[PDB]
Amino acid sequence: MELKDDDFEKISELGAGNGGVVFKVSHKPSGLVMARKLIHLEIKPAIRNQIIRELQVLHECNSPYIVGFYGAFYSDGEISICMEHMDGGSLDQVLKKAGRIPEQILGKVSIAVIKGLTYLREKHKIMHRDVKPSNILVNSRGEIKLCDFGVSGQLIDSMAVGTRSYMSPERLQGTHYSVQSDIWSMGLSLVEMAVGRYPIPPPDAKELELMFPPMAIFELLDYIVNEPPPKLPSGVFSLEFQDFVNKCLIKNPAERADLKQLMVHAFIKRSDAEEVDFAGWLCSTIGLN
Amino acid sequence: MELKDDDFEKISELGAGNGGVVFKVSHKPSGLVMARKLIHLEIKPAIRNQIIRELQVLHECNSPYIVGFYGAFYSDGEISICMEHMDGGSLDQVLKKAGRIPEQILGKVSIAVIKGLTYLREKHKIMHRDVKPSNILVNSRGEIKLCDFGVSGQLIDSMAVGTRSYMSPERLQGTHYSVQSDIWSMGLSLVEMAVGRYPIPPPDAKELELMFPPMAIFELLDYIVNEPPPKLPSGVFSLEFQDFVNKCLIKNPAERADLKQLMVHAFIKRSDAEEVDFAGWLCSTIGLN
Ligand SMILES: Nc1ncnc2c1ncn2[C@@H]1O[C@H](COP(=O)(O)OP(=O)(O)OP(=O)(O)O)[C@@H](O)[C@H]1O
Ligand SMILES: Nc1ncnc2c1ncn2[C@@H]1O[C@H](COP(=O)(O)OP(=O)(O)OP(=O)(O)O)[C@@H](O)[C@H]1O
Ligand SMILES: NCCNc1nnc(-c2ccc(F)c(F)c2Nc2ccc(I)cc2F)o1
Ligand SMILES: NCCNc1nnc(-c2ccc(F)c(F)c2Nc2ccc(I)cc2F)o1
Numbered sequence: 001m002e003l004k005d006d007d008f009e010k011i012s013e014l015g016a017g018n019g020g021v022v023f024k025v026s027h028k029p030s031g032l033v034m035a036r037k038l039i040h041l042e043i044k045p046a047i048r049n050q051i052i053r054e055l056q057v058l059h060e061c062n063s064p065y066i067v068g069f070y071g072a073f074y075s076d077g078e079i080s081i082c083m084e085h086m087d088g089g090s091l092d093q094v095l096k097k098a099g100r101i102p103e104q105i106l107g108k109v110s111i112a113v114i115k116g117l118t119y120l121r122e123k124h125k126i127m128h129r130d131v132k133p134s135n136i137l138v139n140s141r142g143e144i145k146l147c148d149f150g151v152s153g154q155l156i157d158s159m160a161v162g163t164r165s166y167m168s169p170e171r172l173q174g175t176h177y178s179v180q181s182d183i184w185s186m187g188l189s190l191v192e193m194a195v196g197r198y199p200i201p202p203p204d205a206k207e208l209e210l211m212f213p214p215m216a217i218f219e220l221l222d223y224i225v226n227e228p229p230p231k232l233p234s235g236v237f238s239l240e241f242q243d244f245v246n247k248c249l250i251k252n253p254a255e256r257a258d259l260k261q262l263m264v265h266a267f268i269k270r271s272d273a274e275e276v277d278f279a280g281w282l283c284s285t286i287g288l289n
Numbered sequence: 290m291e292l293k294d295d296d297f298e299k300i301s302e303l304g305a306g307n308g309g310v311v312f313k314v315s316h317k318p319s320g321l322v323m324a325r326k327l328i329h330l331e332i333k334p335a336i337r338n339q340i341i342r343e344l345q346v347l348h349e350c351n352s353p354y355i356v357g358f359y360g361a362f363y364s365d366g367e368i369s370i371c372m373e374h375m376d377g378g379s380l381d382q383v384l385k386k387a388g389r390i391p392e393q394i395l396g397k398v399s400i401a402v403i404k405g406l407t408y409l410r411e412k413h414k415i416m417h418r419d420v421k422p423s424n425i426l427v428n429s430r431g432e433i434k435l436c437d438f439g440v441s442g443q444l445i446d447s448m449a450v451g452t453r454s455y456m457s458p459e460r461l462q463g464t465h466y467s468v469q470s471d472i473w474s475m476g477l478s479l480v481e482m483a484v485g486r487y488p489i490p491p492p493d494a495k496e497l498e499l500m501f502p503p504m505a506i507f508e509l510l511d512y513i514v515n516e517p518p519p520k521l522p523s524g525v526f527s528l529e530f531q532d533f534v535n536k537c538l539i540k541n542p543a544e545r546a547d548l549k550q551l552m553v554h555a556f557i558k559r560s561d562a563e564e565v566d567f568a569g570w571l572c573s574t575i576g577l578n
């Protein structure tokens with residue numbers, strides 16, 4: 001069934017930021033609750049038909065690790081992308097309430113993220129381009145899924161920041177980057193979730209022991225590309241986790257790990273085996289179940 | 290008279306970008322056409338009463354070089370600032386259609402900008418913080434006015450980029466900046482308007498003679514703060530204009546000119562004297578009068 005603007009009705013607001021805003025909605029004809037994302041774009045039909053035309057591949061994106069897609073349409077100065085409502089929200093949201101996310105949980109998250117990238121890469125030849133806690137969604141059935149990835153070339157164009165960059169050093173510096181760039185973002189996202197705050201600049205001995213101001217725009221990006229990458233603090237995280245992110249956070253794209261290698265790395269295999277109630281931990285920490 | 294959400298009605302859309310969107314509206318009770326700017330802000334009453342409370346000083350901002358203010362209010366997840374509709378739009382808009390803006394015209398623009406900063410500084414103790422072509426408005430009565438400046442401390446907080454920075458080198462690097470930072474932005478805005486495109490990176494001999502790709506985020510900001518500043522191309526601009534922007538675009542805030550000195554600089558005095566029909570040139574180039 002085709003989605004239309006008038007067939008919907010706002011329930012509430014799930015958050016926004018920079019385009020760029022998302023409602024919990026009701027699709028009257030079907031009964032389903034959906035997440036509707038609105039992207040404002042002043043642009044000529046010609047293109048904003050292409051965009052819509054390029055978003056249709058999302059119908060073909062089926063994976064337990066990819067947020068489900070229902071349809072996209074254009075409606076007075078806004079293109080709308082409708083997706084599965086994930087009632088757990090985004091990892092950036094759960095991190096606030098959680099203070100920190102435990103190593104075992106991030107292990108399950110890492111497995112999800114890696115299987116998603118891999119799926120998008122092998123079956124569709126696409127890089128995510130914007131991996132970070134807020135583009136990782138979770139639900140009460142314990143599922144972990146990626147959204148907001150780079151399906152639309154024309155949309156990639158018609159968009160191209162902030163105060164916190166998850167962009168790899170290479171991508172920050174020039175046109176010479178690609179899929180390996182997603183690994184860096186994942187690395188940084190995990191060190192963030194493991195530690196409770198954006199890991200750059202790294203915490204000093206003082207803050208370190210306490211846990212266990214803003215930076216200027218150039219100050220930040222200059223650090224990322226010219227200083228050593230962040231590390232998981234030692235002692236309080238398995239040595240396997242530490243090696244995993246370290247393999248992720250290597251400044252040189254070709255030296256950095258890729259999906260193949262990360263898929264068979266100690267921390268994955270160990271996390272793969274482990275028995276955890278993510279659904280349980282999630283609702284426990286955010287009050288839902 | 291107080292402004293309320295229901296007393297308005299949309300006429301059309303004047304543009305948007307990053308917050309951040311503006312309608313030509315009709316204030317039913319009064320009959321006036323206004324520009325209504327909507328800023329989305331998920332935040333607690335406590336503050337978004339302060340913000341509104343801090344925007345009231347705009348009522349006290351009266352100057353032929355400052356965009357007129359009618360009122361601000363909050364309405365379901367958006368704070369609204371209502372201003373004089375300027376039927377000429379923004380200098381970034383006129384630049385597209387104009388290809389280039391003539392030296393004589395920029396001279397009048399420079400006088401306006403400088404008198405505005407000066408007004409905000411002397412009578413209200415405030416820096417603009419976001420001077421660039423799109424925050425300079427013009428109308429058919431030939432008036433040139435600044436908007437979007439930093440009245441609200443809490444709003445300054447509750448906001449803190451792109452692909453084109455008009456931020457001074459010092460502001461890009463740290464907390465150690467202030468009003469002198471607006472001079473840099475003005476300098477760069479004029480070199481942009483004089484030349485027809487964002488002046489960084491500077492044009493090569495080839496493009497230079499032809500007139501007469503995107504950069505990466507770090508590539509750009511790194512250039513700004515570590516390479517020489519842009520210059521007006523020689524030969525085709527008065528030597529006084531050249532000295533004016535050069536005095537503006539000096540990387541060191543304390544060495545850079547200030548408003549006092551720019552106010553009595555050759556190019557100003559010369560532009561001050563000159564007789565030009567800005568109202569005429571404006572409508573001519575954008576089809577209005
Ligand atoms: N399918 C969904 N189900 C549930 N919540 C969602 C869904 N999609 C988005 N959201 C919520 O909406 C918020 C805003 O999404 P959006 O992609 O516009 O911004 P963001 O990714 O958080 O930040 P940025 O836009 O700066 O990258 C997200 O943080 C998430 O909490
Ligand atoms: N008072 C006004 N009268 C006429 N047009 C206006 C007025 N205020 C804003 N506009 C138009 O609305 C557009 C969007 O304004 P807004 O401040 O949201 O974005 P911007 O300043 O262009 O870019 P950015 O938000 O990236 O700084 C402006 O470019 C301008 O053309
Ligand atoms: N303030 C910026 C908001 N962040 C963002 N939201 N959607 C995207 C996005 C970008 C490129 C693209 F091609 C998409 F399909 C995109 N959307 C998208 C892709 C897949 C799914 I499943 C759901 C989506 F919303 O980027
Ligand atoms: N996408 C970002 C949009 N750019 C922007 N629009 N308004 C502002 C602004 C910022 C700080 C502030 F304190 C204001 F009053 C502000 N608004 C404001 C101030 C004076 C006048 I006269 C009119 C205004 F809209 O910044």
Ligand SMILES: [Mg+2]
Nearest residue numbers: 134135147148
């Ligand atoms: Mg997102």
Ligand SMILES: [Mg+2]
Nearest residue numbers: 423424436437
């Ligand atoms: Mg503006």
